[PDB]
Design a protein around this ligand. Structure first.
Ligand SMILES: *C(=O)[C@@H](NC(=O)c1c(-c2ccccc2Cl)noc1C)[C@@H]1N[C@@H](C(=O)O)C(C)(C)S1
Length: 417
């Protein structure tokens, strides 16, 4: 009976329709996807073969007595209501252009609300291609793929160390090329001996040996608690599905495992999952919480629902998942992240004439992935970005940062119009 009931439209915040139902002469309705290929994973689909995904799935209730027995009356009475997303089409096009030629994903988010302004996964597909045989492409690498976050997770270790008042940005750390911890070995990248340096510098240069010592000083309970307070263990998304980011049961962790976890590498062996394992969306949520004075927002992608004749049925409200760190801690972490871009591993994210802050990472998976989270402008951030570029075959060292800065710069100009 449901082919005869018109399905509501899915529309961007700037007024671009990405999904629509069209009436047949038959009486039935056919699902049409204008600008087919934009925000495909987010818009989603309902397919017998390929399953259901995205807004088509999560808002299916919304987009979907005596008259019900008459199929001829299904068309007149009740139309589906439409969904206006928080996605902006120009920011979406920006994120999609930056992923051309690469596998991975980008999220652009408003740090004060958690509104998702761009959400792109690559490789992507068109709805036309769902009517044919295809495999990778269908995985939503923003929300439904887990990755070792590598050094980008040091944002959480740093935040926890500062928030528990166990260290400060100017506290010095030995940052040798190799160190014995928990009866195993931790190395800096390239075995680089950095000598004794302040934590802000250990963070800007992404020393594993330094940040591992902080993780060990923190202990497993604190490291796991802080990860969870940033959202680990929560299925992020008010109105979309994200697979929870994972940490171990702290009681099961060893010291060596702890050392590695605090650098973003999951090496545990126990009943509970190894961690951290992250989504890109979770990485955005962390950057956003840091950008927003420590207040974690549950991200969302629907702005509002519109009745068939264009009335506002309802509006999403921003909702907090709590205060993960104090405002004072957040300002310190923001400062440390500025250092990453101004003088450490994130210089590829620099954009002349605007202050960009962030944290980079690289995780071995002979393949490695490149991560970046960041926000801008440094003073009064209005945007957050989270990026993964998957190596696969290629060396992609530093690519996440170059992509991140580019996306932020172009999204700021869009914001400005
Ligand atoms: C965290 O991402 C860090 N990554 C590494 O150190 C990592 C290594 C490596 C080499 C020897 C012993 C242990 C490990 Cl994990 N191999 O692959 C990567 C490079 C640092 N962060 C990165 C950046 O912020 O992206 C680096 C490249 C500066 S190293």
């Amino acid at each position: 009976k449901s082919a005869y009931v018109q399905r509501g439209a899915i529309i961007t915040s700037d007024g671009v329709t990405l999904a629509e139902s069209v009436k047949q002469d038959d009486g039935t309705y056919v699902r049409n996807y204008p600008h087919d290929g934009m925000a495909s994973h987010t818009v989603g689909y309902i397919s017998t073969q390929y399953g259901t995904a995205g807004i088509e799935s999560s808002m299916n209730e919304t987009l979907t007595d005596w008259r019900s027995a008459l199929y001829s009356m299904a068309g007149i009475n009740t139309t589906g209501s439409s969904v206006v997303l928080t996605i902006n089409s120009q920011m979406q096009a920006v994120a999609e252009a930056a992923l051309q030629g690469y596998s991975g994903s980008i999220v652009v988010m408003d740090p004060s609300t958690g509104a998702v302004l761009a959400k792109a996964s690559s490789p992507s597909y068109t709805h036309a291609e769902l009517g044919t045989i295809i495999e990778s492409q269908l995985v939503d690498r923003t929300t439904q793929a887990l990755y070792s976050p590598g050094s980008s997770f040091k944002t959480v270790t740093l935040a926890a160390g500062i928030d528990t008042h166990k260290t400060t940005l100017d506290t010095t750390y030995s940052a040798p090329g190799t160190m014995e911890i928990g009866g195993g070995t931790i190395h800096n990248y390239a075995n680089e001996d950095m000598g004794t340096i302040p934590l802000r510098e250990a963070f800007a240069r992404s020393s594993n040996t330094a940040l591992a010592q902080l993780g060990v000083a923190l202990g497993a309970d604190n490291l796991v608690s802080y990860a969870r307070a940033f959202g680990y263990g929560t299925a992020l998304g008010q109105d979309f599905s994200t697979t929870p980011s994972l940490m171990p049961n702290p009681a099961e962790m060893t010291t060596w495992e702890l050392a590695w976890a605090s650098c973003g590498l999951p090496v545990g062996e126990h009943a509970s999952p190894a961690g951290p394992q992250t989504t890109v969306m979770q990485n955005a949520v962390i950057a956003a919480a840091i950008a927003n004075g420590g207040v974690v927002m549950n991200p969302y992608i629907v702005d509002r629902v519109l009745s068939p004749e264009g009335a506002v049925v309802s509006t999403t409200s921003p909702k907090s998942l709590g205060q993960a760190v104090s405002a004072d801690t957040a300002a310190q972490v923001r400062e440390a992240m500025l250092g990453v871009v101004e003088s450490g591993t994130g210089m590829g994210a620099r954009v002349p004439g605007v202050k960009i802050a962030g944290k980079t990472g690289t995780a071995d998976v002979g393949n490695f992935n490149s991560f970046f989270i960041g926000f801008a402008p440094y003073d009064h951030p209005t945007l957050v970005v989270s990026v993964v570029i998957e190596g696969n075959g290629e060396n992609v060292l530093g690519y996440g940062a170059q992509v991140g800065g580019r996306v932020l710069a172009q999204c700021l100009n869009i914001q400005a119009l």
